[PDB]
Design a protein around this ligand. Sequence first.
Ligand SMILES: Cc1cc2nc3c(=O)[nH]c(=O)nc-3n(C[C@H](O)[C@H](O)[C@H](O)COP(=O)(O)OP(=O)(O)OC[C@H]3O[C@@H](n4cnc5c(N)ncnc54)[C@H](O)[C@@H]3O)c2cc1C
Ligand SMILES: Cc1cc2nc3c(=O)[nH]c(=O)nc-3n(C[C@H](O)[C@H](O)[C@H](O)COP(=O)(O)OP(=O)(O)OC[C@H]3O[C@@H](n4cnc5c(N)ncnc54)[C@H](O)[C@@H]3O)c2cc1C
Lengths: 463, 463
Amino acid sequence: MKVIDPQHSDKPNVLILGSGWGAISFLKHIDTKKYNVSIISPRSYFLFTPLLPSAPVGTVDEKSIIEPIVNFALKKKGNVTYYEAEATSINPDRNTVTIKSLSAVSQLYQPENHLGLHQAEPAEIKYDYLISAVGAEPNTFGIPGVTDYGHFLKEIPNSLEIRRTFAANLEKANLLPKGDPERRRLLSIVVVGGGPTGVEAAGELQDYVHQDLRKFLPALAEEVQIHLVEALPIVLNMFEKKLSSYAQSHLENTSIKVHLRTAVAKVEEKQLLAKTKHEDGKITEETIPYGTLIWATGNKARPVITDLFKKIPEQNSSKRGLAVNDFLQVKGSNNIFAIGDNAFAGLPPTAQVAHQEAEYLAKNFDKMAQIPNFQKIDLLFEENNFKPFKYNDLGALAYLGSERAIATIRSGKRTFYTGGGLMTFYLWRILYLSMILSARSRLKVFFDWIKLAFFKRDFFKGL
Amino acid sequence: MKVIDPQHSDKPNVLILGSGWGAISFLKHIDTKKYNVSIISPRSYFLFTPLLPSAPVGTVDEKSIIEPIVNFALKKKGNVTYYEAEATSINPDRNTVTIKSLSAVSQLYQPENHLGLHQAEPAEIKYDYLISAVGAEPNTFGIPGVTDYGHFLKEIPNSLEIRRTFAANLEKANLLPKGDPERRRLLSIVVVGGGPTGVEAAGELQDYVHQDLRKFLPALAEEVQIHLVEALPIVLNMFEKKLSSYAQSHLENTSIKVHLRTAVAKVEEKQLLAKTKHEDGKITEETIPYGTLIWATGNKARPVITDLFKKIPEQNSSKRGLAVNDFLQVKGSNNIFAIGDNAFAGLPPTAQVAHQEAEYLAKNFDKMAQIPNFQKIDLLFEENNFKPFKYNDLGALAYLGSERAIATIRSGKRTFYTGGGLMTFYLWRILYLSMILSARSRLKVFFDWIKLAFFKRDFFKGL
Ligand SMILES: Cc1cc2nc3c(=O)[nH]c(=O)nc-3n(C[C@H](O)[C@H](O)[C@H](O)COP(=O)(O)OP(=O)(O)OC[C@H]3O[C@@H](n4cnc5c(N)ncnc54)[C@H](O)[C@@H]3O)c2cc1C
Ligand SMILES: Cc1cc2nc3c(=O)[nH]c(=O)nc-3n(C[C@H](O)[C@H](O)[C@H](O)COP(=O)(O)OP(=O)(O)OC[C@H]3O[C@@H](n4cnc5c(N)ncnc54)[C@H](O)[C@@H]3O)c2cc1C
C-alpha cells in the first residue's frame, strides 16, 4: 500500500538512493530547474569518509566531518525532498522503491502538499529516473566471530563503538598488576586490512597512545601494542613499492607490529586465529590476543542491490555490484543508473571514482533535458553523440601516523607528486581540506587541527 | 570490607568529594606539597555550568564546556588520586567515606602502589580531612510526573536527552497536517523556572527555532511555541526591577509566552496542570500542552548529605544543606568542611559562592600546615587569629536570546555595570570566557562562537 507520486509539474521525477559521495556529488550538480529531485537515505548527513579514521581517537570530532543533507539541498533553488528512511526493495516494472524505517520527510522550497505518512510506515516512492548510490557494506568473508567481537570502521556510530571499547579496556587494564597477561591483552589492539583505512586507523590510534595517554598514564601507554594484519605481502598496494616500503618501515618505527601475508581464519572473544604464508611457501598458525579489534577490509553488495540482481535478467550473474554501461546505466534497465561502490564498472571502489561518476552523470542529465525525446534509452545515448564515462585517476594519499604521510598526485599519464614524509603530511592536510564538500566541515576540521597543536585530543567515552 | 589508607608520607590525607565548582576550585589552590589530595566523583570532568543551557541546541558543543579532572591534577606537582566513583556514605567516627560504582582509579605523579580494587567493588576511603562539595540535586517539590516526563538541565547527559526529545518531536510533527493539534503540541516547549537557567534555556531554544530551523522548515518553525513558567511575579529576581522588566519584555518580543505567578500542580504525559494567582487574588487553572518539558527550578540536598544529618547531633535538624561555620567547618565535626550547594551558610546556591568559599578554604589549609598543632579544631581557628569567610557579591549576568543580555557587575557597595542589551551581550561573552577554568575549554567555546557566526549550530540527534 501507499504510493507517493507527484505528477503535476512538468519535470521528470529523479530519485536518488544514498547520501554519500555518489548521491551528494550528484545532488550538487543536478539541474533542479530541469528536474525534481528526491533523496532516500537512512543517514541524514553526508560523511567525509577519508577522515573517519581520525574520529575514534579525537584528532577530529565526529561533527566536524559530517554535513546535514538539507544544507546541500538548500543551495539548490528548485524542489528537493528527503525521506529519512532506507530502501528495502527496488521495483523496476513499477518504477518504485519500497522504503522502511521512515523517521522523517523534509520538503525544501515546497510550500505545498502533505504526503500523509507516519513514522515506520511502509511506502513506495515512484520515480521516472533512479540513481542508485547506496554504497557497499563491510565484508567479513564469512570468517566466524568478526561481527560478534569486532568493530567495523565504516560509519560514525562505529567511531563511538571503538572509543567506548578501548576506553573501557584502558580502565580495566589500569586496575591490574603490570605483569598480568590480562593487562597486556586489554591494552592490545588489532586492525585487519592494510589499506588506507586500516593503516590510518592504526596510525591515529598510535598517535593517541604516544602523544596523549603517555602524558598521564605512561605505565599503560608503554604496554599498549597495536597490530596490523594484511593478507597480501604488501601494505597499501595502490602505491609504488618504494612508498609501501617506507609506509611499512615507518609504522614499524612507531612500534606497530605489521603481520604481512597473514589471513585471519577465525575471531574469538579474546584472540584471533591467523595463518601466515612464508617466503619458502610454508604456512604457520599464530594466536594474537586482542582487547579491541578493528575490521577494515573488503566490500560486499548490499541486500537491496543483491535482491535487484534477480529482478533483471542481465544482472542475474552479477556479484560485486550492478553491471553498468559506459553511460553508467544499469544493464537491462531503461531508467536506472548506478554510481559508486554499488555499481561495478571495473573501477576501484573509491570516493574519487564515485565523485567523477556523479559529475559525469549530472552533466548527462541536463543534456537529456534539452533533447525532446527524453520528455530504448541505451540507443538514444549513442545516437545523440555524447561521451562514455572515462575515469581519470588522480592518484592516492595516505596518513601513516606521527606526522608523516605518503602521496601520489597524477593526471592521465603525467605523475607530479611530493610523497616523502613530513612535507607530504602538510600536503595531505591541505589537500584533504580542499576536497571537503562544505565550508562548515572545512572550518571545523581546521579548528580541530589548530586545537590539536596546543591541547592534543578529547577522548570522552560517553560523548 | 576494604579500607584504602595511605600512611607513610608525613602529610595529612585530604579527601575532596565532587568535581564541580567547589571541589575543582579548591583543588586548583590547595598546596599539594603540604597535603596529599584524593578526589571522589562519579564525573571525571569539570562542568562549566553557566554555558550548559547552550549545549542542547548546539550554540556550544558539550565537549567545549567540560574539562577532564586529570588535566587539573596534572598542573599540581604533588600526589593526587582520583576515584571515579560516588560516595554513598560519610562515616565521621571512622573518618572514612564509603564509595560505590567504582569505574577507575588514576594515581597521578605516583610511581608506586597498587590498591587492589575491582570495578563496582564497595570500598571505604580513609581521610584526615574531608571537603564535601557534592552539590545539590534538582528539586521537583514532589509534583507528580516531573521525573517521568520532564528533563532536568543539570548535567551533560541532560543536554543530549533534550536534543533527542525535541529532535524526535520535530520529525513526528513535520509528518502531520498544519491544522493538526498534535502538530502544535509536539512543536510546543515548556520551561519551568524563571531563573537564569530557565530563561537562558528558553532563549537558546528560541535562537535555534528562529535562526536555524526557520531556514529549511519555516512551516514548522512558525508553529513552535516556547513557554516559560515562573511561580513568583517576576523573572530573574536577583536583578533590579528595571532589568527584570526588560528581560521579560524582550522574551515576549521573541514570541516566548511568559506565565508569571504560575505554579505547576501536576505534569501529565502530554500536558501540565498549572495554577495562576492574579492581581486581585483569584486563582485560575490552565492546561499547557507540551512536547518537550525542561525543569529548571529548585535545589535539594543529596541522600549522602541527608544521611549525614542523622550521624551528627547538631546537624539533626538541617534541611537545605550541612550547617557550617564562619570557617566553613561542618558544625559538630572536627575535620569535615563543606562548600558550595551542599553546605548551608546562608548564601545563594551559586558557582560564584562555591568559587570564593573554595579559595577561602584552600588559603586556610596552607595556613594550618605551618602551625604545629594541626600536625578542638573549632577553637584553634579563633585562637590562631584568622578571618571568618566573607562573601563578596560580584553581581549577576544573564543571556536572554537574540543577542541580548543583562548584567550587573559590582563589588561590595559599589555598582559599576553596563546592563542594556546588545552591548551587554558582548560583555556577557567576554566575561564568561574569562571565568572558564581552563585554556582548552576557553579556546573551544571561542571557536564555537566564531563557527556560529558563519554556519549557525549543529543539531544532530544521535551525537
Ligand atoms: C574509513 C574510510 C576511509 C576511506 N578513505 C578513502 C580515501 O582516502 N580515498 C578514497 O578514494 N576513498 C576512501 N574511502 C572509500 C569511500 O568511502 C567510498 O568509495 C565511497 O563512500 C563510495 O561512495 P558511495 O556514494 O558509492 O557510497 P557511500 O559514500 O558509502 O554512501 C552510501 C550511502 O548510502 C546510504 N545507504 C545505505 N543503505 C541504504 C538504503 N538501503 N537505502 C538508501 N540509502 C542507503 C548510506 O547512508 C550512505 O549515505 C574510505 C572509506 C572508509 C570507510
Ligand atoms: C544549567 C545551570 C546553569 C547555571 N548557571 C550559573 C551562573 O550563571 N552563575 C552562577 O553563579 N551559578 C550558576 N549555576 C549554579 C552553579 O552551577 C552551582 O551553584 C554550583 O555548581 C555549585 O557548585 P558545587 O561544587 O556546590 O556543586 P556542583 O558544581 O554541582 O558539582 C557537584 C559535583 O559533585 C559530584 N557528585 C554528586 N554526587 C556525588 C556523590 N555522591 N559522591 C561524590 N561526588 C558527587 C558531581 O558529579 C559534581 O562533580 C548554574 C547551574 C546550572 C545547573
